[PDB]
Write a protein that holds these residues in place. Structure first.
Motif, mmCIF file in Angstrom:
data_model
loop_
_atom_site.group_PDB
_atom_site.id
_atom_site.type_symbol
_atom_site.label_atom_id
_atom_site.label_comp_id
_atom_site.label_asym_id
_atom_site.label_seq_id
_atom_site.Cartn_x
_atom_site.Cartn_y
_atom_site.Cartn_z
ATOM 1 N N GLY A 51 0.818 -1.314 -0.166
ATOM 2 C CA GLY A 51 -0.055 0.065 0.087
ATOM 3 C C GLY A 51 0.682 1.222 0.090
ATOM 4 N N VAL A 52 0.214 2.329 0.713
ATOM 5 C CA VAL A 52 0.536 3.797 0.335
ATOM 6 C C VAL A 52 0.206 4.452 1.580
ATOM 7 N N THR A 90 -3.569 -1.785 1.886
ATOM 8 C CA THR A 90 -2.866 -1.347 3.134
ATOM 9 C C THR A 90 -2.504 0.320 3.210
ATOM 10 N N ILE A 91 -3.224 0.874 4.104
ATOM 11 C CA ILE A 91 -3.143 2.452 3.956
ATOM 12 C C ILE A 91 -2.383 2.804 5.315
ATOM 13 N N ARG A 92 -1.163 3.449 5.334
ATOM 14 C CA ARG A 92 -0.595 4.071 6.378
ATOM 15 C C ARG A 92 -1.005 5.330 6.550
ATOM 16 N N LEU A 93 -1.459 5.612 7.973
ATOM 17 C CA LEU A 93 -2.263 6.958 8.024
ATOM 18 C C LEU A 93 -1.156 7.745 9.151
ATOM 19 N N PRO A 94 -0.304 8.823 8.768
ATOM 20 C CA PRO A 94 0.232 9.642 9.590
ATOM 21 C C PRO A 94 -0.832 10.396 10.553
ATOM 22 N N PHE A 95 -0.500 10.733 11.763
ATOM 23 C CA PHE A 95 -1.419 11.717 12.660
ATOM 24 C C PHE A 95 -0.341 12.214 13.692
ATOM 25 N N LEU A 96 -0.894 13.329 14.296
ATOM 26 C CA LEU A 96 0.049 13.973 15.452
ATOM 27 C C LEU A 96 -0.422 13.619 16.781
ATOM 28 N N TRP A 97 0.527 13.037 17.440
ATOM 29 C CA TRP A 97 0.521 12.900 19.028
ATOM 30 C C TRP A 97 -0.187 14.331 19.814
ATOM 31 N N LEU A 154 -2.011 2.861 12.130
ATOM 32 C CA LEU A 154 -2.147 4.154 12.661
ATOM 33 C C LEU A 154 -0.474 4.451 12.915
ATOM 34 N N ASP A 155 -0.100 5.660 12.310
ATOM 35 C CA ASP A 155 1.137 5.877 12.427
ATOM 36 C C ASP A 155 1.052 7.164 13.390
ATOM 37 N N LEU A 156 1.621 6.988 14.356
ATOM 38 C CA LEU A 156 2.030 8.234 15.204
ATOM 39 C C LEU A 156 3.250 8.935 14.653
ATOM 40 N N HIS A 157 3.081 10.066 14.265
ATOM 41 C CA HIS A 157 4.186 10.622 13.410
ATOM 42 C C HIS A 157 4.935 11.645 13.738
ATOM 43 N N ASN A 158 5.586 11.280 14.774
ATOM 44 C CA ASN A 158 6.302 12.264 15.802
ATOM 45 C C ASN A 158 7.674 12.304 16.224
#
Length: 315
Positions: free
Chosen positions: A6-7, A45-52, A87-91
């Protein structure tokens, strides 16, 4: 043999020091049509960055319900397209510019964040827990301790979900056994235990000179294979699994050959590699961004998607 292809749908992690920031101005979540477009290309598959900082605006405090709702909406779109959602905790092992391990951000704070996320998503089989994007500026043993705490906290909730655990030094596959950055990820992470026995090691790999993914050059047509081998052999020896959480190549002949070589390599080494997610798609990349696979407004595929789709459909 490869399970996840995925992406990354990038956007929710934008403008990383605007807290909380403004939705649709400073950051965005993906459109439902992004999920269906990539599913149509064979990506499960989807990797989803988000912020803590956006999901948990005070350390050790409650999750922000608005932000959580946005994540849950993306999960519904993933499920509707039979996709897994990472769920990518992109921190980068930081919270509000401060590094994990400082007195301001204790390792226990990350464990609390993941306890809360695990309680929310433990009953969603589509959900994969990406503990931390590209930890750095923390030693490999210190990061390993923080990772262990986080894994333990997740498993205490009953969650059986796949956990993706990175190393430090931007979790580069190429540098997994190196000491440029201190004690190595290979050495430091050999001690990790997952009581739920559903762990994979997340590595990233870019193909430009310094492997930072900042230039649209691939150093050679086979540099992917060369750079993954140290990590692949580490996985195989230690009976562990890996996940290529980020990689990219630019739109030129050497890079296309390198992309084909790397994706073929991951097929040949699928005994240890679970899969991969390309960096990146999402609606907020500028026209000159060399790694975008977001389709155009005209509906057309980006150049690299011809290759990515071939490998994704083969999985």
């Amino acid at each position: 043999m490869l399970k996840y292809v995925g992406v990354n749908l990038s956007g929710a992690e934008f403008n990383s020091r605007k807290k909380p920031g403004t939705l649709f101005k400073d950051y965005t979540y993906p459109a439902a049509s992004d999920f269906s477009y990539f599913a149509g290309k064979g990506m499960n598959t989807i990797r989803l960055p988000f912020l803590w900082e956006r999901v948990q605006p005070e350390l050790n405090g409650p999750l922000d319900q608005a932000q959580l709702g946005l994540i849950k909406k993306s999960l519904e779109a993933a499920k509707a397209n039979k996709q897994y959602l990472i769920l990518d905790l992109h921190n980068y092992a930081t919270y509000s510019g401060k590094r994990i391990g400082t007195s301001d951000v204790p390792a226990g704070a990350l464990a609390d964040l993941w306890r809360r996320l695990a309680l929310e998503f433990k009953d969603d089989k589509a959900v994969i827990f990406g503990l931390m994007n590209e930890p750095n500026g923390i030693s490999a043993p210190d990061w390993a301790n923080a990772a262990q705490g986080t894994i333990t906290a997740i498993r205490k909730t009953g969650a059986k979900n796949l956990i993706l655990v990175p190393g430090t030094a931007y979790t580069g596959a190429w540098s997994w056994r190196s000491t440029s950055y201190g004690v190595s990820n290979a050495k430091a992470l050999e001690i990790l235990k997952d009581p739920g026995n559903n762990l994979a090691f997340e590595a990233h790999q870019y193909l430009d000179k310094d492997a930072s993914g900042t230039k649209p050059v691939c150093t050679s047509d086979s540099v992917g294979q060369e750079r993954l081998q140290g990590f692949t052999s580490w996985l195989r020896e230690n009976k562990q699994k890996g996940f290529l959480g980020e990689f990219a190549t630019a739109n030129n002949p050497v890079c296309d050959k390198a992309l084909e070589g790397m994706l073929t390599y991951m097929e040949k080494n699928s005994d240890v590699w679970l899969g991969w997610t390309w960096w990146a798609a999402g609606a907020w990349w500028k026209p000159d961004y060399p790694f975008t696979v977001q389709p155009g407004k005209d509906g057309s595929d980006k150049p690299q998607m011809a290759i990515l789709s071939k490998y994704a459909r083969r999985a």
